[PDB]
Amino acid sequence: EQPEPRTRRRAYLWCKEFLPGAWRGLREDEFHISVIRGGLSNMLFQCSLPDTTATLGDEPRKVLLRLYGAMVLESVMFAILAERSLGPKLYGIFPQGRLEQFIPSRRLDTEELSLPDISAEIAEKMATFHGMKMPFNKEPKWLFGTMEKYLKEVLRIKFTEESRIKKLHKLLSYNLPLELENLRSLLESTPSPVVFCHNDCQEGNILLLEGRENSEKQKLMLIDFEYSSYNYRGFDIGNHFCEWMYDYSYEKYPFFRANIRKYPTKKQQLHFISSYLPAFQDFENLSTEEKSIIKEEMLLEVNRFALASHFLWGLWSIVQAKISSIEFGYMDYAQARFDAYFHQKRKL
Amino acid sequence: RAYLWCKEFLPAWMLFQCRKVLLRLMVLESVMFAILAERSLGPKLYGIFPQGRLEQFIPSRRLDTEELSLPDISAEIAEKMATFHGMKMPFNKEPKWLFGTMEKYLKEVLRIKFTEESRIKKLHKLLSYNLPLELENLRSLLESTPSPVVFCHNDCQEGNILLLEGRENSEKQKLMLIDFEYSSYNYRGFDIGNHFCEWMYDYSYEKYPFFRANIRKYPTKKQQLHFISSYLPAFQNDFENLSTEEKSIIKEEMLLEVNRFALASHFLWGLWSIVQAKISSIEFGYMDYAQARFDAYFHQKRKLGV
Ligand SMILES: C[N+]1(C)CCO[C@@](O)(c2ccc(-c3ccc([C@@]4(O)C[N+](C)(C)CCO4)cc3)cc2)C1
Ligand SMILES: C[N+]1(C)CCO[C@@](O)(c2ccc(-c3ccc([C@@]4(O)C[N+](C)(C)CCO4)cc3)cc2)C1
Structure with a gap:
C-alpha cells in the first residue's frame, strides 16, 4: 500500500535530511515507502533505499516512520531506551513524528503468551525493564491518577446513539466512583514495589525477532512505551496476565474477543513469577520456605493489581468510545473488562 | 516548588x-542531554519536567579565558571537540543552523528600535556596515570553503569547559564540555573558528561592559597548528598513519577553513548581541560586544585578504 502523495514527499524529506549515507543524496523518484498502518493517527510506514543503492557506511537500508497525526518525556524515554539497546534505535525526531529502526519481526499472538519459554522470557524482559533508572517521577501517582482522570470524563459523557447510551447506563449502574474507592482501599493495603513499568505489556507490544525463533531466552523485545511510568510492579504483571484473555485481532465487530478461561492458571502464574524473581533479584539463594512465602504473596499482589487493569482500561475504553473514531467496539470492550473485574473480584 | 522535584525524582x-x-530552570534539547548523559559525554540526567531539570553536580570550575592557550588544555579541548563531532544524533543533518540563525537575527536587528540614545547611536554605527550586503559576502566566501557537516557544540568556550576537580594533574583527561543549548549539525570549521575567536573574549570582567576583548590573544599559527594536530587524529581514524606531507596538506587547508568560518562566529554573535541588548535583562554591555565582534570581523577579513 502506497501512502498518499503529500506523505510520500514529507517522508522523503525527513529521511533524506535525518538519515546519513546514501540517504542524503537520494532522489524523490528513488525513494521507497509503503504503509504499515493507516488512519487519522499513528500511521506507520516503512521507508527504504532501492535494492540497487549501496550504503556508504552503517546507515540503515530501511527505517520505520511514525507519524503522530508528554511529547518530551515520551521522546526522552524512547531515546534513553534506544541508547540502552532495549528499544529500536532513534534516527530522527521531529514535531510530526519519528524515524526508527526497522526490526524484522512479527508481534506475538495472544495464544503465544502462555507458551512457557515465551512467558519466562517476557518475565525476564519485564524484570530488566523494572530495574532501570529513568529520569521521571518516582511517586506512584499514574495508576489512580489516570483512573481518577478517566472517571471524571466518563461521568460527563452524553451519548446520542441508542446502543451506546444503553451500554453506558449499565456500566454507570455499578457506581464506579464507589467501586473505585473500594479498589483503592484494596490496593492501599497490598504492598507492591514502585518500579519503572511498561504498563501495556501485551502481545501487540512484544516482537518475536526474526532469526532468533530457535533461541529459547532471547527471541523478544518489548516496544511501545507510551503508557510507561513509575508504577506498582503488580500492575505491570497483573495487566500482562489479563492480556492473556484479550485478543485484539478479531476481524468482525467489536474487533476483539475476551475469554475469561484464558487467564493464566496458578501453575502458569508461578512459572512467570519464578523467571521474574531471580531476574529482578540472588533470589535463587533464599530458602525454599522463604522463596514460597515471597512467591505466594506476589501472586496475591499481582492478582489484586490485575483488578486495576480491568478498571483502568475499562474506564479508558469508555472515554475512547466518545473521543476516538477508530473502528473498534470500545463499549463492548468496557463491559468485557468490567465483567472480568467482578468475576476476578469474586474469585478473590 | 523545587524541594518537591527532589523528593519525587531522586x-x-x-x-x-x-x-x-x-x-x-524543548523536546530536542532534552533528548540531546539525555543521549549525552547516556553516553557519559554529559552530566547525568536525574530528573526532567516542564519547568526545568535535575542534573549531576560535577565538582569542577570553569576554565579561564587565559587557560585556553595552555598546550595541554588546548590539546584536550581538540580531542573532546573531535569526539563530540563524531556523534550521531537524531537531528536534522542538513546544515541550516549557521546562516539560518544569522538571517534570523539580521531580520530582527533590521527592525530593532532602541529607546536609549546611546544604543541608538551604537546601532547606527553597526548598520553603517550594510549588514545584509556583508552577510552575502560571507555566504559567498563560506560556500566556496569546503567544511564537513558534523555535530557541533557551537559555543565551545571557557565558560562551558569544566576543569574536573581531582584531575588537574592529568595531562589528557581533566576537562568536560558542557551547555549544549546551541548544539546542532553545522560546519566543523564554525566550531573550531568560534573556539579560536573565544581566546579573545573574557566574559568575567567585573566592570562594564563586563567583558574584555584582546585581539592580540587570537591563537598564533603555531597555536592553531597544535590545536588541529590534536583535533585531526581524534576525528579522522586514518590520519595518524598518513605521510608527513599529506598531513601538512590537510592542516594547511584546515587552517584556511577554520579562519574563514571564524568570520561567521563574529558575524553571528555580533548579530546575536544586538538582539540581546534589546530583549535581555542581564547586566552586560551587549552593544559594546557587538562592536568588538564586528571590529574583529573586519580585522580578520583584512588578515585573510578576503
Ligand atoms: C481492523 N479494524 C476492524 C479496524 C482498524 O483497527 C483495528 O484493526 C483495531 C485493532 C486493534 C485495536 C486495539 C484496541 C485497543 C487496544 C488496547 O490494548 C490499548 N490499551 C492497552 C491502551 C487499552 C486496552 O486495549 C489494542 C488494540 C483497535 C482497532 C480493527
Ligand atoms: C556564546 N554566546 C552565546 C555569544 C557570545 O557571548 C556569550 O559567550 C556570553 C557569555 C556570557 C555573558 C555574560 C553575561 C552576564 C554576565 C554577568 O555575570 C555580568 N554581571 C556581573 C554584570 C551581572 C550578571 O551577569 C557574565 C557573562 C555574555 C555573553 C554567549
Missing part, C-alpha cells in the same frame, strides 16, 4: 545546588 530523598544535584 531516590534517601537559574541554577541551584541541593548526594548533591543541580537544578536548571
